[PDB]
Amino acid sequence: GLAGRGVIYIPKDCQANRYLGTLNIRDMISDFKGVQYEKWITAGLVMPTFKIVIRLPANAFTGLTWVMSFDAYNRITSRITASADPVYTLSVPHWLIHHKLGTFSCEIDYGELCGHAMWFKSTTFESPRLHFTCLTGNNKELAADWQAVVELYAELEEATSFLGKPTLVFDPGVFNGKFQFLTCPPIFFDLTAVTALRSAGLTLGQVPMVGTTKVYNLNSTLVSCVLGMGGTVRGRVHICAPIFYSIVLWVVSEWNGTTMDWNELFKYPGVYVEEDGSFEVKIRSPYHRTPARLLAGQSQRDMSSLNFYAIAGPIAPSGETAQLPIVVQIDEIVRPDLSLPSFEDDYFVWVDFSEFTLDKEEIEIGSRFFDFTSNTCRVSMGENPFAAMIACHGLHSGVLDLKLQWSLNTEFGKSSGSVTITKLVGDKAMGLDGPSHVFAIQKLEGTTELLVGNFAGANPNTRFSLYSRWMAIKLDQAKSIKVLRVLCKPRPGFSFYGRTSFPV
Amino acid sequence: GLAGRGVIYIPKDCQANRYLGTLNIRDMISDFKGVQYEKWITAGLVMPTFKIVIRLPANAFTGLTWVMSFDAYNRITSRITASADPVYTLSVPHWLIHHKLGTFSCEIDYGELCGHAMWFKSTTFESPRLHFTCLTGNNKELAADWQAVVELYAELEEATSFLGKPTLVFDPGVFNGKFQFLTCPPIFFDLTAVTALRSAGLTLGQVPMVGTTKVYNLNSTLVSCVLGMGGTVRGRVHICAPIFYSIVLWVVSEWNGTTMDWNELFKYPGVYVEEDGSFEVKIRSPYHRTPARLLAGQSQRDMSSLNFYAIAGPIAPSGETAQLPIVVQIDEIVRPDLSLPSFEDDYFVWVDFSEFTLDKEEIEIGSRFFDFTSNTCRVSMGENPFAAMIACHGLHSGVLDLKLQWSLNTEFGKSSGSVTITKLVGDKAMGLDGPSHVFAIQKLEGTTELLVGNFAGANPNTRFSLYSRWMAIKLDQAKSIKVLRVLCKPRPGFSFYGRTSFPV
Amino acid sequence: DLSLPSFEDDYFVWVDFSEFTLDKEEIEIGSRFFDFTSNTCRVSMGENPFAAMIACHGLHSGVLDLKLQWSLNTEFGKSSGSVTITKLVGDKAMGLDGPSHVFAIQKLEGTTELLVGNFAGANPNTRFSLYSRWMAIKLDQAKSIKVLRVLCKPRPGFSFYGRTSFPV
């Protein structure tokens, strides 16, 4: 039944990118309080399937399109409260809300989209939010300020387990070609132009940016798992303007620039788009595939692109001035021609330690896979899809096999000491002794396993304190080491929960 | 499920007649608030079946017995908060709570015991209460103050109708001989006495008193519907003392005094009582029946009584000092020898008006059957079982046939004017005109019907304002009237809801 | 979930006449159910659903049973005269004589039927002139009456035609 509610205020002038507000999902249920809220207190833990309903007067004369963004791990909130770049709002699970369609509804399986069960008395990891932003603005301001109502419907029952089912399990050789929640920021057409071109890059492994901020997300991370891709792009086009705006588009794929000859343009295999609908366009390339990521100094336009040509319009009655926005969603690469996977089932670099200033150095790892920092030596972190996947999920869990390699800074004959791997259960202070391991420095390499997890079952992508196994690397002659490299190779079944994003 | 809760506080010295507290049933549910409370808000109206549970550490060493009294219409609250005489606490539906039995439970069909459905937002008539009082005290104080927990369990669902099913329907010729909630105040035996007698009167139509206060109740009212009764009294006896107290009773019926000869006493048909249990004793009388009520200067002992003779004990270890209490419950008269009904299916006196001081007099009746007052004339109200039944229920509804009779104060030849019966729907100010009726004073009598009820379906036994038909008697030559008598005769199906009591 | 009906199948108040200024008073009813006016006495009209229904339809037709009740203004022993119910077919001038009826004032009550209708079949809610039965109440000692009350009870099948409204 109705479990919780909230209100979004809409400014009489709702421009593209306006932050409209954030609702806190747990507060919606607890402020309402709530037949469902009271069932929750008894259950303790709930893994709801929500129906979210946004009540909203339908109107075809505004052109307004909003985005509801499900931010279960509070990753974009900080960055959108002034203004919400679409790159942020579309980097987490989200839904387009078209004003022409009025009242909106969708399902959120909290087991999938989030991954951990909700505790009645307090937030466990971070507090789950719904963000409401404006993707395409109104063509002219409306008569007055107004509001929309957000409602949560659910039948809460006691959760049997803490963890959901994993959204993703790590596998280098597996990127199907199907996507979810891959929405391109809006493309705009001026009505003061008789024709026009808008390119969308198809180099989908590229990490999106907002100014100097990189926004890592699961989709670009997935694509990066492959060297390149060919095939047909299946997607949907939304025309986000008032009924009295209209346009006709020729949508086609081109390689390295665009032709300047209108007649050549129409000898290509494209499709016409007059209205909201799906489309399929073949990725066009001399190699039949476009590369997954760019090299130094190449552009996305240098490769295969999805080109939107306005061949008639846009038109509108006078005196409208608003641009006509097109929102593109990419659903999958059908009939895919994939390259080799970019990585094999092999080790990859986690971290290099170098330039040691003290002979005694102790690197605490504990039960986490994360970015190191040191005041006493130089840390160089690895960048690879696995690390990105860690960053683009709320929770993860698994086992990493480690290979340690090191070279000497001093003469081999003078060398002494060891790379020691301390393995405990608990912490340095009260822990139990596991398979700790002393590698004489002359071995020049060593191996160990690392449990990434804890008694609860999964790690957040932050610092946390939960009883688990505990690991540390101890150097006693660190100045004799030119470099200590740590490689890892996830054991099968390394699991990720709740897709999200990670701005840096 | 658990719907509401509350706490009663017990003093280390809990003496007979201590008032322990009152819980407000609706507050218990709303303060808890409550999966059931929230279901209630949606239903609007509920007609619950409650399971009441009193949690209570069982103990055989105290002698403590409490009474929970269900006072849905707030009739005894005022009178028990200083001291709670058992006459008040047992005059409404109630339950004995024996300390030796520990945790206590019972069902309350709110449809029967109360009669009207509960409105989520506010009290409709009066606010339903549970009173907790001590019936028999502890033999010696306990070690410390303590508490008991009261719990309401219910599965609230929306009520289809406002009114329950009627507890009682008026019928002069119908008193079965079965009782509910007929509990006699505790009888006490001193342990400083080798034998003893305690009489319980069997003149059950007599109205119980607390000081100068009459406590009208349904049971005595029922018995008054008959001229007398013979047969066998079936009941239960509770011995309300610690396991280390014990007694043996000879229980027998006697007429007009008691025999002084122990040998004669045991030639009577009595029963022995050694412990908690049921009993059957024949009502002994020269006429085989004892009268339902007393005449002037008669005494309850002059008739048939139920006598409790302590023939062995009570005994207790030294140095106990408490008396041993016996609580008697009367369940029915089995194999009943009833007298004629005291009333036939006929009219009875509602009210006499006399001694008018003004020629213009207007008596407003409206839609109620109630006690009149006047500053301008003498009101003499009738006392009969019907009036008592009105007083001993929370709600009632039905139709009364009225006969009006009057005699002249002036000479007949000089007489003028009328007894006018105004009949409206609504009120004097905005009402519609019904079967109003002008009786020329010389008619000397007249008849009319009166609806006792309203749009909601029933009347409380208080002043209330609910749209209904409206009646008034209008005199224009009142000084010419020596007496205006109004008789009434309830039409079949006159209904009463929720048995209760009425102290005056 | 309905309440009781507000009215039962019973009489209700049509009109009270009171405060008579002349001993000779004659109230013409004819064949209509309507609001009375008098220059010589006080008219108090009843308000009930039946009267509203009469007002909220274009035409109506039926039969009303009447109960007349009255109380005296003078001393009973001095009373004389009558409440007379004149019943004609036609009009006062050329009519035929029906069940006219003389109630000695001392009876203090009387009954009669009234046809609400006419040869055409129904009455408008206005004044009209259509041949029908004709009724009048005749007082000869009206100053001796404190109040004359007229109750009516429609016989089954009292009919209304054409729903409408009535602003006042």
mmCIF file of N, CA and C in Angstrom, chain C residues 67-164:
data_model
loop_
_atom_site.group_PDB
_atom_site.id
_atom_site.type_symbol
_atom_site.label_atom_id
_atom_site.label_comp_id
_atom_site.label_asym_id
_atom_site.label_seq_id
_atom_site.Cartn_x
_atom_site.Cartn_y
_atom_site.Cartn_z
ATOM 1 N N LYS C 67 -57.796 16.034 8.106
ATOM 2 C CA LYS C 67 -58.251 16.049 9.486
ATOM 3 C C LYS C 67 -58.278 17.501 9.938
ATOM 4 N N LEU C 68 -59.421 17.947 10.451
ATOM 5 C CA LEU C 68 -59.522 19.290 10.982
ATOM 6 C C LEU C 68 -59.544 19.189 12.503
ATOM 7 N N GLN C 69 -58.724 20.009 13.169
ATOM 8 C CA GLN C 69 -58.725 20.095 14.632
ATOM 9 C C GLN C 69 -58.825 21.534 15.092
ATOM 10 N N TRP C 70 -59.550 21.782 16.179
ATOM 11 C CA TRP C 70 -59.628 23.143 16.691
ATOM 12 C C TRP C 70 -59.820 23.210 18.194
ATOM 13 N N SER C 71 -59.315 24.293 18.784
ATOM 14 C CA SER C 71 -59.492 24.559 20.212
ATOM 15 C C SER C 71 -60.279 25.861 20.407
ATOM 16 N N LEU C 72 -60.971 25.984 21.535
ATOM 17 C CA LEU C 72 -61.798 27.162 21.774
ATOM 18 C C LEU C 72 -61.048 28.348 22.379
ATOM 19 N N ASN C 73 -61.514 29.542 22.042
ATOM 20 C CA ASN C 73 -60.993 30.781 22.600
ATOM 21 C C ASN C 73 -61.884 31.292 23.732
ATOM 22 N N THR C 74 -63.184 31.044 23.614
ATOM 23 C CA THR C 74 -64.137 31.377 24.660
ATOM 24 C C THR C 74 -64.382 30.186 25.611
ATOM 25 N N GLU C 75 -65.209 30.379 26.634
ATOM 26 C CA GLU C 75 -65.571 29.291 27.534
ATOM 27 C C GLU C 75 -66.440 28.236 26.839
ATOM 28 N N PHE C 76 -66.122 26.966 27.076
ATOM 29 C CA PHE C 76 -66.809 25.870 26.404
ATOM 30 C C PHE C 76 -68.310 25.968 26.565
ATOM 31 N N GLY C 77 -68.755 26.332 27.765
ATOM 32 C CA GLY C 77 -70.174 26.409 28.071
ATOM 33 C C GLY C 77 -70.908 27.508 27.321
ATOM 34 N N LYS C 78 -70.155 28.468 26.791
ATOM 35 C CA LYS C 78 -70.756 29.578 26.049
ATOM 36 C C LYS C 78 -70.715 29.354 24.539
ATOM 37 N N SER C 79 -70.037 28.289 24.111
ATOM 38 C CA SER C 79 -69.790 28.045 22.696
ATOM 39 C C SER C 79 -71.051 27.755 21.881
ATOM 40 N N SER C 80 -71.014 28.195 20.625
ATOM 41 C CA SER C 80 -72.089 27.934 19.667
ATOM 42 C C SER C 80 -71.503 27.932 18.250
ATOM 43 N N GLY C 81 -72.316 27.560 17.262
ATOM 44 C CA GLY C 81 -71.873 27.587 15.881
ATOM 45 C C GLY C 81 -71.156 26.330 15.434
ATOM 46 N N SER C 82 -70.383 26.464 14.358
ATOM 47 C CA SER C 82 -69.873 25.320 13.610
ATOM 48 C C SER C 82 -68.651 25.628 12.747
ATOM 49 N N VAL C 83 -67.878 24.578 12.494
ATOM 50 C CA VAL C 83 -66.967 24.521 11.369
ATOM 51 C C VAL C 83 -67.722 23.758 10.276
ATOM 52 N N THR C 84 -68.071 24.447 9.185
ATOM 53 C CA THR C 84 -68.812 23.816 8.086
ATOM 54 C C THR C 84 -67.936 23.577 6.865
ATOM 55 N N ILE C 85 -67.997 22.367 6.316
ATOM 56 C CA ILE C 85 -67.248 22.063 5.111
ATOM 57 C C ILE C 85 -68.218 22.045 3.951
ATOM 58 N N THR C 86 -68.162 23.074 3.108
ATOM 59 C CA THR C 86 -68.980 23.101 1.897
ATOM 60 C C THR C 86 -68.305 22.294 0.785
ATOM 61 N N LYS C 87 -69.023 21.316 0.227
ATOM 62 C CA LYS C 87 -68.505 20.518 -0.883
ATOM 63 C C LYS C 87 -69.434 20.648 -2.081
ATOM 64 N N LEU C 88 -68.920 21.220 -3.169
ATOM 65 C CA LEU C 88 -69.704 21.416 -4.384
ATOM 66 C C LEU C 88 -69.048 20.716 -5.554
ATOM 67 N N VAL C 89 -69.781 20.668 -6.664
ATOM 68 C CA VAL C 89 -69.180 20.388 -7.960
ATOM 69 C C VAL C 89 -69.504 21.564 -8.866
ATOM 70 N N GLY C 90 -68.472 22.286 -9.279
ATOM 71 C CA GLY C 90 -68.677 23.495 -10.054
ATOM 72 C C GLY C 90 -68.034 24.645 -9.323
ATOM 73 N N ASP C 91 -68.856 25.617 -8.935
ATOM 74 C CA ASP C 91 -68.398 26.772 -8.170
ATOM 75 C C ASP C 91 -69.501 27.261 -7.248
ATOM 76 N N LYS C 92 -69.184 28.261 -6.434
ATOM 77 C CA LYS C 92 -70.144 28.744 -5.459
ATOM 78 C C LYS C 92 -71.434 29.184 -6.177
ATOM 79 N N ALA C 93 -71.303 29.698 -7.391
ATOM 80 C CA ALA C 93 -72.436 30.308 -8.081
ATOM 81 C C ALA C 93 -73.425 29.339 -8.733
ATOM 82 N N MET C 94 -72.919 28.297 -9.387
ATOM 83 C CA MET C 94 -73.767 27.416 -10.203
ATOM 84 C C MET C 94 -73.550 25.936 -9.900
ATOM 85 N N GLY C 95 -72.871 25.651 -8.796
ATOM 86 C CA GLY C 95 -72.469 24.296 -8.466
ATOM 87 C C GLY C 95 -73.548 23.354 -7.967
ATOM 88 N N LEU C 96 -73.212 22.073 -7.956
ATOM 89 C CA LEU C 96 -74.080 21.031 -7.445
ATOM 90 C C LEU C 96 -73.626 20.701 -6.035
ATOM 91 N N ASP C 97 -74.547 20.206 -5.216
ATOM 92 C CA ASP C 97 -74.241 19.953 -3.804
ATOM 93 C C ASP C 97 -73.772 18.548 -3.512
ATOM 94 N N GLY C 98 -72.557 18.447 -2.975
ATOM 95 C CA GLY C 98 -71.971 17.160 -2.626
ATOM 96 C C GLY C 98 -72.077 16.842 -1.149
ATOM 97 N N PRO C 99 -71.070 16.148 -0.611
ATOM 98 C CA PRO C 99 -71.025 15.752 0.797
ATOM 99 C C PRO C 99 -70.556 16.885 1.705
ATOM 100 N N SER C 100 -71.252 18.019 1.636
ATOM 101 C CA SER C 100 -71.054 19.132 2.568
ATOM 102 C C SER C 100 -71.380 18.623 3.955
ATOM 103 N N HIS C 101 -70.871 19.302 4.963
ATOM 104 C CA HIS C 101 -70.759 18.661 6.257
ATOM 105 C C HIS C 101 -70.710 19.746 7.334
ATOM 106 N N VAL C 102 -71.586 19.633 8.329
ATOM 107 C CA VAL C 102 -71.663 20.612 9.416
ATOM 108 C C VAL C 102 -71.138 20.029 10.720
ATOM 109 N N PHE C 103 -69.976 20.507 11.151
ATOM 110 C CA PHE C 103 -69.423 20.078 12.421
ATOM 111 C C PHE C 103 -69.784 21.101 13.498
ATOM 112 N N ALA C 104 -70.672 20.738 14.423
ATOM 113 C CA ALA C 104 -70.951 21.619 15.556
ATOM 114 C C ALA C 104 -69.613 21.954 16.201
ATOM 115 N N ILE C 105 -69.407 23.214 16.576
ATOM 116 C CA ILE C 105 -68.106 23.639 17.110
ATOM 117 C C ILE C 105 -67.622 22.785 18.285
ATOM 118 N N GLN C 106 -68.560 22.231 19.053
ATOM 119 C CA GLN C 106 -68.240 21.397 20.202
ATOM 120 C C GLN C 106 -67.612 20.056 19.836
ATOM 121 N N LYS C 107 -67.737 19.602 18.587
ATOM 122 C CA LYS C 107 -67.054 18.374 18.151
ATOM 123 C C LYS C 107 -65.545 18.533 18.267
ATOM 124 N N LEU C 108 -65.065 19.740 17.999
ATOM 125 C CA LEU C 108 -63.652 20.069 18.174
ATOM 126 C C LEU C 108 -62.718 19.366 17.177
ATOM 127 N N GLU C 109 -63.313 18.610 16.254
ATOM 128 C CA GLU C 109 -62.576 17.988 15.157
ATOM 129 C C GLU C 109 -63.515 17.439 14.088
ATOM 130 N N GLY C 110 -62.978 17.251 12.895
ATOM 131 C CA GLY C 110 -63.754 16.712 11.792
ATOM 132 C C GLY C 110 -62.856 16.213 10.667
ATOM 133 N N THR C 111 -63.414 15.383 9.784
ATOM 134 C CA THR C 111 -62.641 14.844 8.668
ATOM 135 C C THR C 111 -63.343 15.032 7.326
ATOM 136 N N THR C 112 -62.560 15.091 6.252
ATOM 137 C CA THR C 112 -63.125 15.199 4.909
ATOM 138 C C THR C 112 -62.075 14.799 3.873
ATOM 139 N N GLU C 113 -62.509 14.518 2.649
ATOM 140 C CA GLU C 113 -61.576 14.274 1.561
ATOM 141 C C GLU C 113 -61.515 15.522 0.700
ATOM 142 N N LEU C 114 -60.390 15.728 0.023
ATOM 143 C CA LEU C 114 -60.292 16.811 -0.957
ATOM 144 C C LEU C 114 -59.713 16.297 -2.265
ATOM 145 N N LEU C 115 -60.455 16.491 -3.359
ATOM 146 C CA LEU C 115 -59.907 16.151 -4.667
ATOM 147 C C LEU C 115 -59.000 17.272 -5.132
ATOM 148 N N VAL C 116 -57.710 16.966 -5.300
ATOM 149 C CA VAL C 116 -56.766 17.901 -5.901
ATOM 150 C C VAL C 116 -56.604 17.531 -7.373
ATOM 151 N N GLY C 117 -57.337 18.236 -8.234
ATOM 152 C CA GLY C 117 -57.396 17.906 -9.642
ATOM 153 C C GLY C 117 -58.606 18.551 -10.272
ATOM 154 N N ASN C 118 -58.976 18.091 -11.462
ATOM 155 C CA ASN C 118 -60.063 18.706 -12.235
ATOM 156 C C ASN C 118 -60.382 17.860 -13.467
ATOM 157 N N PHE C 119 -61.380 18.276 -14.244
ATOM 158 C CA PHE C 119 -61.800 17.495 -15.402
ATOM 159 C C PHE C 119 -60.650 17.175 -16.359
ATOM 160 N N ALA C 120 -59.657 18.060 -16.460
ATOM 161 C CA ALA C 120 -58.533 17.828 -17.371
ATOM 162 C C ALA C 120 -57.578 16.759 -16.866
ATOM 163 N N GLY C 121 -57.444 16.641 -15.544
ATOM 164 C CA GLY C 121 -56.688 15.552 -14.939
ATOM 165 C C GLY C 121 -55.577 15.918 -13.959
ATOM 166 N N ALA C 122 -55.211 17.194 -13.901
ATOM 167 C CA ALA C 122 -54.083 17.624 -13.083
ATOM 168 C C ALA C 122 -54.108 19.138 -12.847
ATOM 169 N N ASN C 123 -53.467 19.584 -11.770
ATOM 170 C CA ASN C 123 -53.387 21.009 -11.465
ATOM 171 C C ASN C 123 -51.994 21.532 -11.699
ATOM 172 N N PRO C 124 -51.896 22.734 -12.278
ATOM 173 C CA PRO C 124 -50.633 23.472 -12.333
ATOM 174 C C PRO C 124 -50.360 24.054 -10.955
ATOM 175 N N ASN C 125 -49.140 24.520 -10.707
ATOM 176 C CA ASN C 125 -48.834 25.092 -9.404
ATOM 177 C C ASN C 125 -49.064 26.594 -9.418
ATOM 178 N N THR C 126 -50.177 26.993 -10.024
ATOM 179 C CA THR C 126 -50.562 28.388 -10.115
ATOM 180 C C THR C 126 -52.070 28.450 -9.933
ATOM 181 N N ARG C 127 -52.637 29.647 -10.015
ATOM 182 C CA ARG C 127 -54.088 29.764 -10.068
ATOM 183 C C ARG C 127 -54.513 29.391 -11.498
ATOM 184 N N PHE C 128 -55.642 28.699 -11.599
ATOM 185 C CA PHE C 128 -56.190 28.274 -12.879
ATOM 186 C C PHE C 128 -57.703 28.154 -12.668
ATOM 187 N N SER C 129 -58.466 28.075 -13.750
ATOM 188 C CA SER C 129 -59.904 27.896 -13.630
ATOM 189 C C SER C 129 -60.359 26.740 -14.500
ATOM 190 N N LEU C 130 -60.480 25.563 -13.906
ATOM 191 C CA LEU C 130 -60.950 24.385 -14.641
ATOM 192 C C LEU C 130 -62.005 23.633 -13.833
ATOM 193 N N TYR C 131 -63.177 23.437 -14.437
ATOM 194 C CA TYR C 131 -64.296 22.735 -13.792
ATOM 195 C C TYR C 131 -63.858 21.530 -12.954
ATOM 196 N N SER C 132 -64.259 21.518 -11.691
ATOM 197 C CA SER C 132 -63.899 20.419 -10.805
ATOM 198 C C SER C 132 -64.770 20.453 -9.565
ATOM 199 N N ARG C 133 -64.498 19.555 -8.630
ATOM 200 C CA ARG C 133 -65.128 19.644 -7.321
ATOM 201 C C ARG C 133 -64.597 20.899 -6.627
ATOM 202 N N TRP C 134 -65.325 21.374 -5.625
ATOM 203 C CA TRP C 134 -65.018 22.666 -5.023
ATOM 204 C C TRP C 134 -65.262 22.591 -3.516
ATOM 205 N N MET C 135 -64.275 23.001 -2.724
ATOM 206 C CA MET C 135 -64.392 22.928 -1.271
ATOM 207 C C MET C 135 -64.178 24.287 -0.594
ATOM 208 N N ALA C 136 -64.878 24.504 0.514
ATOM 209 C CA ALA C 136 -64.669 25.704 1.320
ATOM 210 C C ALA C 136 -64.896 25.392 2.795
ATOM 211 N N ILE C 137 -64.147 26.068 3.667
ATOM 212 C CA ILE C 137 -64.381 25.971 5.104
ATOM 213 C C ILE C 137 -65.118 27.243 5.543
ATOM 214 N N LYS C 138 -66.244 27.081 6.236
ATOM 215 C CA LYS C 138 -67.060 28.215 6.664
ATOM 216 C C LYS C 138 -67.147 28.283 8.184
ATOM 217 N N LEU C 139 -66.590 29.351 8.750
ATOM 218 C CA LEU C 139 -66.715 29.651 10.175
ATOM 219 C C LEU C 139 -67.823 30.697 10.440
ATOM 220 N N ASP C 140 -68.678 30.450 11.429
ATOM 221 C CA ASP C 140 -69.715 31.439 11.776
ATOM 222 C C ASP C 140 -69.454 32.085 13.162
ATOM 223 N N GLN C 141 -68.557 31.472 13.933
ATOM 224 C CA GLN C 141 -68.197 31.951 15.264
ATOM 225 C C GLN C 141 -66.677 31.917 15.418
ATOM 226 N N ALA C 142 -65.980 32.404 14.398
ATOM 227 C CA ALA C 142 -64.538 32.239 14.289
ATOM 228 C C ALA C 142 -63.769 32.841 15.451
ATOM 229 N N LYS C 143 -64.315 33.889 16.059
ATOM 230 C CA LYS C 143 -63.635 34.529 17.180
ATOM 231 C C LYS C 143 -63.612 33.603 18.396
ATOM 232 N N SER C 144 -64.485 32.597 18.405
ATOM 233 C CA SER C 144 -64.503 31.596 19.476
ATOM 234 C C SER C 144 -63.485 30.468 19.256
ATOM 235 N N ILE C 145 -62.708 30.551 18.176
ATOM 236 C CA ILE C 145 -61.699 29.535 17.876
ATOM 237 C C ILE C 145 -60.291 30.064 18.075
ATOM 238 N N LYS C 146 -59.501 29.381 18.892
ATOM 239 C CA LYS C 146 -58.137 29.845 19.127
ATOM 240 C C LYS C 146 -57.245 29.437 17.957
ATOM 241 N N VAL C 147 -57.500 28.236 17.439
ATOM 242 C CA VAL C 147 -56.779 27.724 16.277
ATOM 243 C C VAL C 147 -57.559 26.649 15.514
ATOM 244 N N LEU C 148 -57.551 26.770 14.193
ATOM 245 C CA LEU C 148 -58.099 25.744 13.330
ATOM 246 C C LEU C 148 -56.938 25.147 12.556
ATOM 247 N N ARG C 149 -56.634 23.878 12.819
ATOM 248 C CA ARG C 149 -55.509 23.223 12.164
ATOM 249 C C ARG C 149 -56.020 22.251 11.123
ATOM 250 N N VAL C 150 -55.420 22.297 9.934
ATOM 251 C CA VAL C 150 -55.764 21.360 8.870
ATOM 252 C C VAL C 150 -54.603 20.449 8.509
ATOM 253 N N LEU C 151 -54.753 19.159 8.809
ATOM 254 C CA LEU C 151 -53.759 18.152 8.429
ATOM 255 C C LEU C 151 -54.228 17.396 7.193
ATOM 256 N N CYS C 152 -53.277 16.953 6.378
ATOM 257 C CA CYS C 152 -53.624 16.137 5.223
ATOM 258 C C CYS C 152 -52.722 14.906 5.125
ATOM 259 N N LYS C 153 -53.237 13.891 4.422
ATOM 260 C CA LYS C 153 -52.549 12.626 4.196
ATOM 261 C C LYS C 153 -52.902 12.150 2.794
ATOM 262 N N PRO C 154 -51.943 12.244 1.861
ATOM 263 C CA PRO C 154 -52.223 11.898 0.468
ATOM 264 C C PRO C 154 -52.584 10.430 0.338
ATOM 265 N N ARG C 155 -53.680 10.152 -0.360
ATOM 266 C CA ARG C 155 -54.026 8.783 -0.706
ATOM 267 C C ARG C 155 -53.045 8.247 -1.724
ATOM 268 N N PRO C 156 -52.797 6.941 -1.664
ATOM 269 C CA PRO C 156 -51.815 6.282 -2.521
ATOM 270 C C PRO C 156 -52.058 6.635 -3.974
ATOM 271 N N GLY C 157 -50.984 6.914 -4.699
ATOM 272 C CA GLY C 157 -51.105 7.255 -6.100
ATOM 273 C C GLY C 157 -51.199 8.746 -6.370
ATOM 274 N N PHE C 158 -50.862 9.564 -5.382
ATOM 275 C CA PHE C 158 -50.782 10.994 -5.633
ATOM 276 C C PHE C 158 -49.615 11.261 -6.598
ATOM 277 N N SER C 159 -49.931 11.889 -7.730
ATOM 278 C CA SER C 159 -48.994 11.940 -8.848
ATOM 279 C C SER C 159 -48.438 13.319 -9.190
ATOM 280 N N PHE C 160 -47.167 13.329 -9.577
ATOM 281 C CA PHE C 160 -46.486 14.545 -9.990
ATOM 282 C C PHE C 160 -45.953 14.398 -11.418
ATOM 283 N N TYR C 161 -46.085 15.466 -12.195
ATOM 284 C CA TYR C 161 -45.670 15.468 -13.583
ATOM 285 C C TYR C 161 -44.677 16.592 -13.865
ATOM 286 N N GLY C 162 -43.578 16.240 -14.535
ATOM 287 C CA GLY C 162 -42.579 17.206 -14.978
ATOM 288 C C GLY C 162 -41.755 17.888 -13.896
ATOM 289 N N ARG C 163 -40.627 17.288 -13.546
ATOM 290 C CA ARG C 163 -39.785 17.862 -12.503
ATOM 291 C C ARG C 163 -39.279 19.252 -12.897
ATOM 292 N N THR C 164 -39.312 20.173 -11.941
ATOM 293 C CA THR C 164 -38.838 21.536 -12.160
ATOM 294 C C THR C 164 -38.387 22.156 -10.826
#
